[PDB]
Paper text:
With a prevalence of 25–50/100,000 people, type 1 narcolepsy (T1N) with cataplexy is a sleep disorder that currently lacks a cure. It results from the loss of HCRT-producing neurons in the hypothalamus, causing an undetectable level of HCRT in the cerebrospinal fluid. The vast majority (~98%) of narcoleptic patients carry DQB1*06:02 (in association with DQA1*01:02 encoding DQ6α/β heterodimers), compared to ~25% in normal individuals. Prepro-HCRT is processed intracellularly to two neurotransmitters, HCRT1 and HCRT2 known to interact with the HCRT receptors, HCRTR1 and HCRTR2, with different affinities.
Nine peptides showed moderate to strong competitive binding (53–97.4% inhibition of the indicator EBV peptide) to DQ6. Interestingly, five of the DQ6-binding peptides were from highly homologous regions (iii) and (iv) at the C-terminal of each of the two processed neurotransmitters. Each region contains a NetMHCIIpan-predicted register (NHAAGILTL or NHAAGILTM), also implicated by empirical binding data. We further investigated cores of the strong-binding peptides using X-ray crystallography. The structure of DQ6-HCRT56–69 bound to DQ6 confirmed the predicted 9-aa core register (NHAAGILTL). The observed cross-binding capacity was also consistent with the structural similarities in these DQ6/peptide complexes. The two homologous epitopes at the C-termini of HCRT1 (NHAAGILTL) and HCRT2 (NHAAGILTM) may make different contributions to autoimmunity rather than redundantly boosting the response.
Residue numbers in the entry:
A (entry chain A): 2 to 183
B (entry chain B): 3 to 104, 113 to 190
C (entry chain C): 1 to 13
């Protein structure tokens, strides 16, 4: 690798045949500075605090995606149509801060070693899917060109809570349920 | 079976010593294999694997392409450092430090930024190295880290256990005391 | 006050 005090990705351009779909983000020291909503054609911030560190003009990202789609078709033929290897992701679930009964917390589900970047991350409360209070990062890049993604669930800790993070991925024979143990 | 074909382009800026050393590396990647690269220290494109030889030769033969990528060291890396990264590098989030028992003592150091931290355990003002288990640094993804440091404990009466946390945001290290 | 970004080139061959 390259030794350096700080690394920025300006940007991470992802484009995949499946979908097809693209993703445009800038990263700094491994965290997501901003993304571009490719459908609305608008720069956006998962973490709005970081919008005070400059905007971004989105047409450059959309031009990149057009070229990325073009380049991908070329590389698929260069590599005689060799599809992506489905890696086995690695899932871990933890809380943002120490758990205190009745004090709002955040459950964090880290899905690491993701490739290809095609994944379903869902939260289960007492074995049932939960949509309220859920958010997630973009596919965040790694120097081995795999990805990780993190999902969040805000919740009020209780004595008989039952939470799982459920991950579906072609690298898994069956959906992986990772139980949260306080 | 379902399958995917992935193209990635990474415009990566490496900074050392503030702005003293700046290095642009653009990477062209099929699936997980980087096949072509521009490295500003080299100054021309290189084929990382055979499948990138067409593109290196094609790009290196066009003066306008070469000048355009070389310029990005200034117009992207040095530019975004002044616009964004200088300020981001001044951002400080002070860690929350808490001790809770479970014998084992658990020092939770949560919600801090940036990542550089040192968590030490003391018993009666003496540093404890043995029986200490520290997690790796934990990236929360929301621009904070956490780290958990457990200490194996056999308390005598009158014992004071201190968790000692040094972090760039702190004027002086945070000490949290615990006694049975 | 805008961030800039590296451009993706179209390939050869
Ligand atoms: C980070 O960059 C600065 C600026 O070049 C370095 O400071 C210089 O170091 C030499 C040797 O100590 C001195 O003779 C110069 O007078 C310094 N320049 C200034 C403006 O003060 C600093 O050493 C750098 N750090 C590292 C690890 O390379
Ligand atoms: C990964 C890859 O490029 N595979 C093959 C390559 O080995 C071969 O030389 C070419 C012509 O046979 O067809 C394709
Ligand atoms: C994720 O959910 C979608 C819903 O359309 C489903 O079709 C797809 O098979 C799931 N993805 C994986 C990797 O299982």
């Amino acid at each position: 690798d390259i030794v350096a005090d700080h690394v920025a990705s300006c940007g991470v351009n992802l484009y995949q045949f499946y979908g097809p779909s693209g993703q445009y983000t800038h990263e700094f020291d491994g965290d997501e500075q901003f993304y571009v909503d490719l459908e609305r054609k608008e720069t956006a911030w998962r973490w709005p605090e970081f919008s005070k560190f400059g905007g971004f003009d989105p047409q450059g990202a959309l031009r990149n995606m057009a070229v990325a789609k073009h380049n991908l078709n070329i590389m698929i033929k260069r590599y005689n149509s060799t599809a992506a290897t489905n890696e086995v992701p690695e899932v871990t679930v933890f809380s943002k801060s120490p758990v205190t009964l009745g004090q709002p917390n955040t459950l964090i589900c880290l899905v690491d070693n993701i490739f290809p970047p095609v994944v379903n991350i869902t939260w289960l409360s007492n074995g049932q899917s939960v949509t309220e209070g859920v958010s997630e990062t973009s596919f965040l890049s790694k120097s081995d060109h795999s990805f990780f993604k993190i999902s969040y669930l805000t919740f009020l800790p209780s004595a008989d809570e039952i939470y799982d993070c459920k991950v579906e991925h072609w690298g898994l024979d069956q959906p992986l349920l990772k139980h949260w143990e306080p | 079976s379902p399958e995917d074909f992935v193209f990635q382009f990474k415009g990566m800026c490496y900074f050392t010593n503030g702005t003293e050393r700046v290095r642009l590396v653009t990477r062209y990647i099929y699936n997980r294999e980087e096949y072509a690269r521009f490295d500003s220290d080299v100054g021309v494109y290189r084929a990382v694997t055979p499948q990138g030889r067409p593109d290196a030769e094609y790009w290196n033969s066009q003066k306008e392409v070469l000048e355009g990528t070389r310029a990005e060291l200034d117009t992207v890396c040095r530019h975004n450092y002044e616009v964004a990264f200088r300020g981001i590098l001044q951002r400080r989030v002070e860690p929350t430090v808490t001790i809770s028992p479970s014998n084992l003592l658990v020092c939770s150091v949560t919600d801090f930024y940036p990542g550089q931290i040192k968590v030490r355990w003391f018993r009666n003002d003496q540093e404890e190295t043995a029986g200490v288990v520290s997690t790796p640094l934990i990236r929360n993804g929301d621009w904070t880290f956490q780290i958990l440091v457990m200490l194996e404990m056999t308390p005598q009466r009158g014992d004071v256990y201190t968790c000692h946390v040094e972090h760039p945001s702190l004027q002086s290290p945070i000490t949290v005391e615990w006694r049975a | 006050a805008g961030n800039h970004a590296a451009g993706i080139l179209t390939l050869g061959k």
